[PDB]
Amino acid sequence: NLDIIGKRIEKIKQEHETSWHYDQDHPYKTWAYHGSYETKQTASSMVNGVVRLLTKPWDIIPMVTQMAMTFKEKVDTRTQEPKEGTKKLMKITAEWLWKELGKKKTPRMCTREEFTRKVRSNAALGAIFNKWKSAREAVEDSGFWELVDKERNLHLEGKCETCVYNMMSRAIWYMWLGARFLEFEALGFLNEDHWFSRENSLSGVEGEGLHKLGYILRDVSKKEGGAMYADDTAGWDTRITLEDLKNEEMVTNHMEGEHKKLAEAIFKLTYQNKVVRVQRPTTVMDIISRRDQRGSGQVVTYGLNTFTNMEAQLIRQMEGEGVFKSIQHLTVTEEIAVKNWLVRVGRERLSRMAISGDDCVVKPLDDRFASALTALNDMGKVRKDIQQWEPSRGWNDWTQVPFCSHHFHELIMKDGRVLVVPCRNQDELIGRARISQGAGWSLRETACLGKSYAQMWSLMYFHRRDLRLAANAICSAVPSHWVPTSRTTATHEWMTTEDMLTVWNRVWIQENPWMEDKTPVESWEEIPYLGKREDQWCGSLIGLTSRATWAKNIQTAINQVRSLIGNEEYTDYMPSMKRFRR
Ligand SMILES: [Cl-]
Ligand SMILES: [Zn+2]
Ligand SMILES: [Zn+2]
């Protein structure tokens, strides 16, 4: 307890000795409270004018317009200790899974060089602003690396001084860039060396890309077995137990030397013991601590969530198949049955899943899985929007299954070849592209962000009539050579100044392992749309008077945006579409 967290607490107290006070009206029940001190400060969603002026029909659609306007009662909850049988199942499964993921991979430290190159290319490292201004500045100053060095040698000694979280159905725990570096040095290998690629992990989809996910779900659908289950957990990060954090820490059993010691310190000192500062308007700063729940950098969070979800879903599969009778206690012979199941069919059972952090799709051996709930509930992974003991409802058609905020369509090209394409309600797509984050955007930077959205729509959502037209309009309205940008960067093949038809051919034909015929497409007119009724079902405005007037008059909208940006070199992409081709 305070032997591991006291030093961080001590150090903060001293910096605010003028304001330290144990507030008696503290709201915390499940977090340990330590003290408060004096502060005063707040990041709203800003509208992208380039995208909004080229999507006029959506100006009167509240599902779009409300997205730009405007659970900490879930962070302050507790999870009970799992039963002895559950703890045994989790430990056996986690031991087996780290070994499988480690068969073709070697754990290793990530470098100052790799970290530096990440900060110098706008990767979201979830850091806090104060001695240096930006991350770019800290990394180019040797004083920083000496602070890093002091902490590093403290971690080798099994102690922590400066690794403190700042809190802000979501929750982002920002840390100072130094604490983020030390996390990346020790555990960055999971992401940098693709431990959760589908080739390496069989259930994972890390690095796969939205153009691959539908093909992966269709391949799972080809297995013999029951319905496809896609159960969402209520507040996954808040249901990570101390037992889960101890099973995740077993990755260190595969390490050696300095690396082993630096990783053991991240898990012990920052994950299994956390120090957090939170803004309360009563504005003060609260210093609180706890042992359990997920609070890591977003990229390490993704890999450990994927690990623990793979573990939880294999155990749910074991329960459905009758491998064990009760979570109260595993007999010695059930332990051997469980290990033997993993060796015999574990890899096949992983291939029945698609798992992206807390998001899963599972095609079990049969539908006993639907009512196999004792281990899942006792591990704390309680299903969202269903009563605790009500059997899961599965999907009978892979094209209906939700995954990574999408569903997937099978789309047949005029030439017979089959595309499996990503989709979601079109109001969500248009409303997101109309929003920016942060201050000081120039008109050029705003245009280049609109171009990023447009090129994403051309590559992923070309099959939606309204998005192909709006993408062509935005690309016509932004100078042809201006480079697409994002401040907050999976595979992003639309982030390029290469011709989008060339990129479409590379992604959907040349490099697509599910497309046997590699004949290139010569024009956008060869690339199909959803059926008109299906496009409407998925939120198209095709058929509305507002949409018809927008489509007819699109050159007027394009010319409005060109007049604002000024006298630049532009390309007309509208004649790539049959209706503007004379
Ligand atoms: Cl269905
Ligand atoms: Zn530390
Ligand atoms: Zn759809």
- Enumerate the known binding-site residues for Zn(2+): 151, 155, 160, 163, 407, 409, 423, 538
- Cα of 399 vs centre of ligand 3, distance in Å, is 9
Buried b (16+ CB within 10 A) or exposed e, 526-564: ebbebeeeebbebbbbbeeeebeebbeebeebbeebbee
Give the helix ranges, DSSP H, for 131-176: 135-139, 142-156
Terminus-to-terminus CA distance in the chain, angstroms?
Answer: 75
Q: Which two tokens stand for residue 6?
A: 């006291």
**CA gap 285, 281 in Å, rounded:** 9
Contacts of 25 (CB under 8 A, 6+ apart): 282
Q: Which amino acid is it at 212?
A: K
Query: Tokens 């969070």 identify what position?
Result: 301
The alpha carbon of 216 and the centre of ligand 3 are apart by a number of angstroms equal to 17
Structure tokens at 339: 């290990």
Strand bridging mode 173-176 / 127-128: parallel
Ligand 1 centre distance from Cα of residue 322 (Å): 26
Burial of residue 130 (number of CB atoms within 10 Å: 0-12, 13-18, 19+): exposed
Helix orientation angle between 257-265 and 177-187, rounded to the nearest 10 degrees: 130
Cα–Cα distances in Å, from 121 out to 7, 125, 411?
A: 34, 11, 36
CB proximity list for 358: less than 8 A, separation 6 or greater: 232, 233, 236, 237, 305, 309
Name 410's bridge partners: 420
**Best CA proximity match to 38, nearest among 225, 283, 215:** 283
Nominal resolution in Å?
Answer: 1.5
3-state secondary structure 169-237: CCCCEEEEHHHHHHHHHHHCHHHHCCCCCHHHHCCECCCCCHHHHHHHHHHHHCCCCCCEECCCECCHH
* Nearest ligand (C-alpha, residue 183): 2
| Beta strand residue intervals within 13-104, DSSP E | 32-38, 45-47
What is the Cβ-side half-sphere exposure of residue 566, based on CA atoms within 13 angstroms?
Answer: 2
CA of 130 to the centre of ligand 2 (A): 18
Backbone angles phi, psi at 437, to 5 degrees: -125, 145
Annotated binding site: 151, 155, 160, 163, 170, 232-233, 235-237, 305, 358-359, 384, 407, 409, 423, 538
Q: What is the DSSP letter of 293?
A: S
Q: What residue has token string 């099994």?
A: 158
Distance 204 CA to ligand 3 centre (A): 24
CA distance 495 to 486: 9
Contact 303, 204 (CB under 8 A): no
Q: Which ligand is nearest to the CA of 180?
A: 2
Distance 464 CA to ligand 3 centre (A): 9
Q: How far apart are CA 51 and CA 134, in angstroms?
A: 29
The ligand placed nearest to the CA atom of residue 271 is 2
Identify whether the C-beta of residue 463 lies closer than 8 Å to the C-beta of residue 409: yes
Three-state secondary structure call for residue 383: strand
For residues 79 and 24, give the distance between their C-alpha atoms in angstroms, rounded to a whole number. 25
The residue count of the chain comes to 582
What is Dmax (Cα atoms) for the chain? 78
Q: Which residues contact 99 (CB under 8 A, 6 or more apart)?
A: none
Q: How far, in Å, from the CA of 400 to the mean position of ligand 1?
A: 5
CB 420 within 8 A of CB 514: yes
Q: Backbone phi, then psi, for 407, in 5-degree steps?
A: -125, 175
| Residue positions forming the annotated binding site for Mg(2+) | 232-233, 358-359
406 HSE (CA, 13 A, CB side): 19
Give the amino acid at 166: N
3-state secondary structure of 481: coil
Contact 579, 551 (CB under 8 A): yes
Chain Cα centroid distance, residue 202: 18
What is the DSSP track for 548-568?
Answer: HHHHHTHHHHHHHHHHHH-S-
Ligand 3 centre to CA of 537 (Å) is 7
Q: What does DSSP assign to residue 331? A: -
Say which residues have a Cβ less than 8 Å from residue 561's Cβ, sequence separation at least 6.
50, 53, 54, 447, 477, 478
Would you kindly state where each structural domain of the chain is located, as residue ranges?
1-38+111-187+242-291, 50-55+404-580
Amino acid at 318: M
Spatial CB neighbours of 400, under 8 Å, sequence gap ≥ 6? 407
- Rounded CA separation 135/148 (Å): 14
Assign residue 386 a region: left if phi > 0, alpha if psi is -120 to 50, beta otherwise? beta
The total of other beta-carbon atoms located within 10 Å of residue 333's CB is 8
Residue by residue, DSSP assigns 407-450 as: EEEEEE-TTS-EEEEEE--HHHHHHHHTEEESS---HHHHHHHH
Q: Which ligand is the nearest neighbour of the Cα of 150?
A: 2
395 CA to middle of ligand 1, Å? Answer: 4
Cα–Cα distance for residue pair 130/132, rounded to 1 Å: 6
Of 51, 91, 93, nearest to 68 by C-alpha is 51
CATH superfamily, region 1-38+111-187+242-291: Flavivirus RNA-directed RNA polymerase, thumb domain (3.30.70.2840)
Q: Which ligand number lies closest to the CA of residue 407?
A: 3
Question: Which residue from 501, 431, 496 is spatially nearest to 472, judged by alpha carbons?
Answer: 501
The DSSP-derived string for 301-327 is HHHHHHHHHHHHHHHHHHHHHTS-S-S
Q: CB of 189 within 8 A of CB of 107?
A: yes
198 closest CA partner among 218, 186, 181, 212? 212
Backbone phi, psi, residue 380, to 5° = 90, 5
Instruction: Using alpha carbons, select from 107, 109, 130, 110 the residue that is nearest to residue 119.
Output: 110
Which residue type, as a one-letter code, is found at position 90?
Answer: M
